[PDB]
Design a protein around this ligand. Sequence first.
Ligand SMILES: Nc1ncnc2c1ncn2[C@@H]1O[C@H](COP(=O)(O)OP(=O)(O)O)[C@@H](O)[C@H]1O
Ligand SMILES: [Mg+2]
Length: 330
Amino acid sequence: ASVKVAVRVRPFNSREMSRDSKCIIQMSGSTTTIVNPKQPKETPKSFSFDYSYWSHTSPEDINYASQKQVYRDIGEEMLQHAFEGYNVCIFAYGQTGAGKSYTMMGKQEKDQQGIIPQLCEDLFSRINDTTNDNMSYSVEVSYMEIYCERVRDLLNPKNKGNLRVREHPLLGPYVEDLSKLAVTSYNDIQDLMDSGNKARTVAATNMNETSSRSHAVFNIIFTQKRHDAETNITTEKVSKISLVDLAGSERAKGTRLKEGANINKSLTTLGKVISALAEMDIPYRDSVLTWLLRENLGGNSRTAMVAALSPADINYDETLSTLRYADRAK
Ligand SMILES: Nc1ncnc2c1ncn2[C@@H]1O[C@H](COP(=O)(O)OP(=O)(O)O)[C@@H](O)[C@H]1O
Ligand SMILES: [Mg+2]
């Protein structure tokens, strides 16, 4: 499938605990139902997806969708599509606090690593364990934040200023002066991640709360160089992997007119793009995010989205909204 959609519900968080929230979400197979706390005597609205991940409890539970499970269904198949020579995208969509960052980057400890570190680890593992003198590889990475139409390099502490996305008259859009680093090992790319994740939550980021108002894009340029001993020449196969942690879907009160405008525009545009992609079996320039990722959202590409869901009753409206958004992706 060129477009896969999964939803994932998390355990209660602190706000919900202090609120004595009821769980209004239940799952069965590929189906997720949601109860309207103000109307308990109804039958819940139902939704069906490629995957409905029940992670509302914990790894101690036999039925708990772990980071490992999610990655092996969605992430693993994407990496394989990249080895086959084509571009891929994985988006985490949802309300602030619903579980987007946890699903994508997760935690630094044992057992809690998200899609990004698991995919990177898997990649280098397949590379180093590739036995063949004719096959060599190169892995380059970029990590940035898209906030109010401007780009922030997370791999360069003194990213002096806000870099613009530009459209090369022939080779496509790109971020000017954005750092792209060649990495030769996992611990090395892992170093970059930690370093970038660190930059997303420093104290200064609380001024404009960019951790929840900007889109975080982790890009990997995967190049496979194929040698051939007969008539001695290499053929390069380049795959682009974009792993995205979108801005909170609820900010699309207290939200500034322009932050909200851009975020709405971004999420709305991404939705049209994906629905179109799923249609095929497209206004890219309408937002910086969809503009920068156009090549990873083409007819050749493959995309998957994981929509994070809060379990509690207090977030019924935003959670329904997220489910509808995922349902439209198709
Ligand atoms: N499946 C999960 N298992 C354990 N903790 C989770 C899960 N999903 C989310 N969380 C916790 O919930 C909070 C919300 O997620 P992040 O913080 O992922 O928010 P957002 O969706 O805004 O990026 C974090 O404290 C995270 O540790
Ligand atoms: Mg987050």
